[PDB]
């Protein structure tokens, strides 16, 4: 929507954390980080869903959304392996300055910043709440009793774990669908058996289904039809049946002979 | 079995660069880490291909070379930014050691290891050896006269803009199979009018082309018929065809009727 305010709110983690010389509001900044690529991604995604399928490209633009979204887990990793290689320098050389006001103002425009995001989507975004509040505690810890100092590499390696197994599922979802599997709510067996309900149709040979993009589906079969039997109505009822139920975008349906 | 000397010859790049506190030698074992990774996800790929496909899986497991060499590149990527930081650190802070008494060595290994490694693959083979080359250049340059210091951080930079520029093209290649583009070598043009070729056929509505690796292609369409045309000689026409042709492992044609 008009969610440009939190690219501005970016810049107040980067600079103030850079003051404070802390990596806990690297973390909050990372998971702004991942939170901008996803919203980022999809507009893209949206610019480019309009433009037609060229002859080069023949099923058209719909794969920016995974390859959006691979991007911005892949930077989310870039982030965390670099903050943990810092932390863990951090905590073995103990000599580092660390100020609490800085970190204090800067978790406070995170949290301002989280509760904004979350009253635009009115999950892990709830999960990552959880986080900013997590480290404005810390930022209050550091800045109140200044001889602690170990505060902040602590934080930044829950923080970082936290992000990884948040962003886990996603991965997964984008490593499925460029691999080429069967859509999560599609079932191979639920169509197979409607596939072969279709008066005339005896068996299936090839039965593809994949997904473009979460929204995009699409499926191929080779159904082989009993000879007494209209090819055409049959693949007409068979794509009216696939479309109704399973909501496919495409059905390229070879019609053999039995 | 390349890899099985040279992921020991590997170890000597590690520890060689870290007594000479070099950055060529860096490059050198990024080099050394795009090839050891691009094989190794070829071998990996073709474990996961001998399997059969799953009710999960519709196409197999081809997609595992794209994902390997994805992979590859996002670690080349890795390793290339990390040396980009240390060398733009290293310039301007003029304040290191390094001693050729190990980088001369290591880059003897090095060249020796690529002279071995093409001697296996008997392209980017003559790029690789102008790199190793030119790092072996830096290392004499640097021994034989201490004084000069400033020729790690440069060699750093160009062999990371060479090991760029090499694999640009694999990622774009990459990019394409993901976005299911049309494959480089099928032109879509001379798969339609093969279609258009065919008795019977008059026009083809929705044909689609698309490569799950470099070496595996399928295809759809939506031929319609003329009236007075056999179905299944038509689709079996049509599918030999682009076999013979095209080389498409898979055909899905739906026949349709005009």
């Not at 109505?233 to 139920?245: G, H, I, M, T, W």
């Amino acid at each position: 929507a008009a969610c440009a305010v939190c690219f501005v709110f970016m810049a107040g983690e980067v600079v103030g954390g850079y003051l404070a010389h802390s990596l806990a509001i690297m973390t909050d900044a990372a998971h702004l980080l991942a939170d901008v690529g996803s919203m980022m991604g999809s507009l893209f995604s949206l610019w480019l869903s309009t433009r037609p399928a060229t002859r080069t490209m023949t099923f058209g633009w719909h794969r920016s959304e995974t390859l959006g979204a691979l991007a911005s887990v892949v930077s989310l990793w870039m982030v965390t392996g670099i903050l943990l290689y810092l932390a863990f320098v951090r905590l073995l050389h103990s000599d580092y300055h660390i100020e609490g006001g800085a970190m204090l103002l800067t978790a406070s425009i995170a949290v301002c910043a989280n509760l904004l995001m979350a009253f635009v989507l009115h999950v892990h975004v709830l999960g990552d709440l959880l986080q900013s509040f997590g480290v404005l505690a810390a930022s209050i810890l550091i800045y109140f009793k200044p001889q602690y100092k170990a505060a902040d590499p602590i934080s930044t390696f829950l923080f970082s774990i936290c992000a990884l197994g948040s962003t886990a599922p996603t991965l997964r979802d984008v490593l499925r669908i460029l691999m080429e599997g069967t859509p999560r709510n599609v079932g191979f067996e639920p169509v197979r058996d409607t596939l072969l309900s279709v008066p005339g149709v005896r068996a299936t040979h090839e039965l593809h289904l994949w997904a473009l993009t979460l929204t995009y589906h699409v499926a191929s079969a080779h159904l082989a039809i009993d000879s007494t039997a209209d090819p055409e109505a049959v693949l007409a009822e068979a794509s009216s049946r696939l479309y109704s139920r399973f909501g496919f975008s495409s059905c390229t349906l070879q019609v053999e002979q039995y």
